Amino acid sequence: HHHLANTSAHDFSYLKFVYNATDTSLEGSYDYIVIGGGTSGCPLAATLSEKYKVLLLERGTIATEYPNTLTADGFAYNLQQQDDGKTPVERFVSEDGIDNVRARILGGTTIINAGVYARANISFYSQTGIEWDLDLVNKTYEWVEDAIVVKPNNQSWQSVIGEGFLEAGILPDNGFSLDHEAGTRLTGSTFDNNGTRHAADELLNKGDPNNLLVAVQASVEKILFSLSAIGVIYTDSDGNSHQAFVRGNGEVIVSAGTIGTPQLLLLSGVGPESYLSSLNITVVQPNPYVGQFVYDNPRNFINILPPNPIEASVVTVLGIRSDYYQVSASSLPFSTPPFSLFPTTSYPLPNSTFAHIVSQVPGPLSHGSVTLNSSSDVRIAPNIKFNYYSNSTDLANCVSGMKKLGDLLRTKALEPYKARDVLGIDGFNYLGVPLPDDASFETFCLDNVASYWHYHGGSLVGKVLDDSFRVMGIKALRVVDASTFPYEPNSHPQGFYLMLGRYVGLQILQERSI
């Protein structure tokens, strides 16, 4: 861990090659166009820019416009803030009725997220069947980690929860480790030890400033085709249209996220033939899987209200089993809810410091889809449905996770945070529904599910893409973001998708060097 980032201010040096999409002089030909300045898209664009002329198009603005994105303390503020169409948090509600958010900002979800950093479970690579260059994967993790990842300092709540996971039998003790492994560990964070957020936008500082151009408030509406992708149409904040193209052996990559990538493919006539024909969208490339296999790992939780104040913390201490991944954060109270922290706006608000104690279902096996709400306007959010707990294996895994949270609440570690010194976990004061017979745990899992925010899928490798992230049947078109896999790489996937953007950039540059 010689290589990890130090405490430092958020590096906005890259703003020297960031322009308003209102600038028509950005229109023209590039070697690469990357759609979406987010978790995968920023490192992808930085990496291609080492050798080639790159245009990165981001629909949001720069994070300096929203300073509460740049500190650990600001996390809740960005979710509390009303969505006016400009804000870094975009609010949505799945058709399941569960409140959710996605990013709208240069840096993508790494600018608004909970900062937890992990590398992929090392069994993930073989599970995919992709011929990964594993040495290069690890060099690329170090490239990300040297820029924006730290070893967290001690936080009293994270240390309580770590002792509790160990006492609850989530073994072994892995100490400090970036790796997704069974047991309890301190992992990395993209918040530094002064609370400064570091993010994917900082990876643009690794780009060649003579080769990389970024347009912000660039809403990419259509991929243009020859069958080859040739370019994009994008609109600016004033509503005017702009075109950009790729040249020679160049490519368009879609990095618009689980929601934005399938949406743009569909709008561009890449998607299921009967569905697109039903909307009178001319089919450029029939593929029955665009917007299919869309996943949201369940979050289930209790909230305890200790009788004495607890210090607020960012999540750094993870409890990992194959069937559930658990963490806890401690928070100040609030009178405005952070949107999607609880599954609906109609949720009791805490009046005192509280601990959010959570469990994540792996996979999940339940899936849904993304469909268009507008056949024309990319600023109109698509419909999304996850079908939480439609697969009974997911419900069984939540039962196991909820019993383990019961074990955690029974530990000597957590005993001092009880309101009453009674033998039972009814000694805790709860915000919302306390833990409750498999049927009671089943009801609790179904009724109180929230989003883990780790949604993925909709443009899967093996369905829409080949093992090189190419859209099947289309030249010069790739997708690189969380739309690409039907299972998590680990409990906290930002690390994997930061790595993936640069990795695929390197694979593109290698493919082309021959």
Ligand X SMILES: Cc1cc2nc3c(=O)[nH]c(=O)nc-3n(C[C@H](O)[C@H](O)[C@H](O)COP(=O)(O)OP(=O)(O)OC[C@H]3O[C@@H](n4cnc5c(N)ncnc54)[C@H](O)[C@@H]3O)c2cc1C
Ligand Y SMILES: C[C@H]1OCc2cc(C=O)ccc2O1
In the complex, minimum distance from the CB of residue 382 to ligand NAG, in angstroms, rounded to a whole number: 8
**500 near ligand X (CB under 6 A):** no
Among 4, 15, 93, 114, interactor with ligand X by CB under 6 A? 114
Contact set for ligand Y, span 248-267 (CB under 6 A): none
DSSP per-residue letters across 76-142: HHHHHS---SSSSEEEEE-TTS-EEEEE-BTTGGGGTS--EE-B--TTHHHHHT----HHHHHHHHH
DSSP per-residue letters across 358-396: EEE-SS-S--BEEE-S-SS-TTSPPEEE--TT-SHHHHH
Contact set for ligand NAG, span 57-96 (CB under 6 A): 61
Among 356, 385, 454, 456, interactor with ligand Y by CB under 6 A? 356
Among 10, 242, 492, 502, interactor with ligand X by CB under 6 A? 492
Q: How far apart are CA 459 and CA 51, in angstroms?
A: 28
* Mask for 264-303, x = binds ligand NAG (CB under 6 A): ---------------xx-----------------------
Q: Which is nearer to ligand NAG, 228 or 392 (CB)?
A: 392
Question: Is the Cβ–Cβ distance between 475 and 227 less than 8 Å?
Answer: yes
In the complex, minimum distance from the CB of residue 231 to ligand X, in angstroms, rounded to a whole number: 14
Among 103, 276, 284, 305, interactor with ligand X by CB under 6 A? 103
Contact set for ligand NAG, span 123-162 (CB under 6 A): 123-124, 127, 134-135, 138
Give strand ranges (E) for 187-236: 188-189, 212-216, 219-225, 229-235
- Taking alpha carbons only, the member of 94, 90, 83 closest to residue 450 is 94
- Residue 306, helix vs strand vs coil: coil
**297 near ligand Y (CB under 6 A):** no
Task: Name the strand (E) or helix (H) holding 176.
Answer: strand 173-176
Which one of 98-106, 143-151, 157-165, 464-472 is the stretch in contact with ligand X (CB under 6 A)? 98-106
For residue 312, the tally of other CB atoms under 10 A from its CB is: 17
Among 329, 372, 449, 480, interactor with ligand Y by CB under 6 A? 329
**20 near ligand NAG (CB under 6 A):** yes
Burial class (CB in 10 A: 0-12, 13-18, 19+), 77: middle
Question: Is the Cβ–Cβ distance between 233 and 222 less than 8 Å?
Answer: yes
Among 36, 207, 338, 382, interactor with ligand Y by CB under 6 A? 338
**235 near ligand X (CB under 6 A):** no
Total number of residues that touch ligand Y (CB under 6 A):
12
Burial class (CB in 10 A: 0-12, 13-18, 19+), 224: middle
* Ramachandran area for residue 144 (φ above 0: left; ψ -120 to 50: alpha; else beta): alpha
**119 near ligand NAG (CB under 6 A):** yes
Total number of residues that touch ligand NAG (CB under 6 A):
29
Residues in the chain, overall count: 514
**433 near ligand NAG (CB under 6 A):** no
Catalytic site includes residue 492 = yes
Q: Which is nearer to ligand NAG, 355 or 384 (CB)?
A: 384
**Peptide linkage before 486 cis (omega within 30 of 0):** no
Both tokens assigned to 445: 């899992």
Task: Name the strand (E) or helix (H) holding 29.
Answer: strand 28-35
Question: Is the Cβ–Cβ distance between 255 and 479 less than 8 Å?
Answer: yes
**358 near ligand Y (CB under 6 A):** yes
Question: Is the Cβ–Cβ distance between 201 and 58 less than 8 Å?
Answer: no
In the complex, minimum distance from the CB of residue 236 to ligand NAG, in angstroms, rounded to a whole number: 7
**Peptide linkage before 172 cis (omega within 30 of 0):** yes
Contact set for ligand Y, span 65-84 (CB under 6 A): 75-76
Contact set for ligand NAG, span 367-426 (CB under 6 A): 373, 383, 391-393
Q: How far apart are CA 103 and CA 109, in angstroms?
A: 5
**114 near ligand Y (CB under 6 A):** yes
**164 near ligand X (CB under 6 A):** no
Contact set for ligand NAG, span 175-234 (CB under 6 A): 179-180, 182, 216-217
Question: Is the Cβ–Cβ distance between 245 and 231 less than 8 Å?
Answer: yes
* Mask for 40-79, x = binds ligand X (CB under 6 A): xx---------------xxxx-------------------
Contact set for ligand NAG, span 229-268 (CB under 6 A): 237-238
DSSP per-residue letters across 438-460: HHHHHHHHHHT-EE-S--EESS-
**Choosing among ligand Y, ligand NAG, ligand X, none, which partner's interface includes residue 383 (Cβ < 5 to 8 Å by kind)?**
ligand NAG
**108 near ligand X (CB under 6 A):** yes
Which one of 241-249, 461-469, 487-495, 503-511 is the stretch in contact with ligand X (CB under 6 A)? 487-495
**326 near ligand X (CB under 6 A):** no
Point out which residues bind ligand X (CB under 6 A). Answer: 35-41, 57-60, 101-105, 108-110, 112-116, 218-220, 255-258, 260, 264, 378, 453-454, 481-482, 492-495, 497
Q: Any idea which residues carry the catalytic annotation?
A: 454, 492
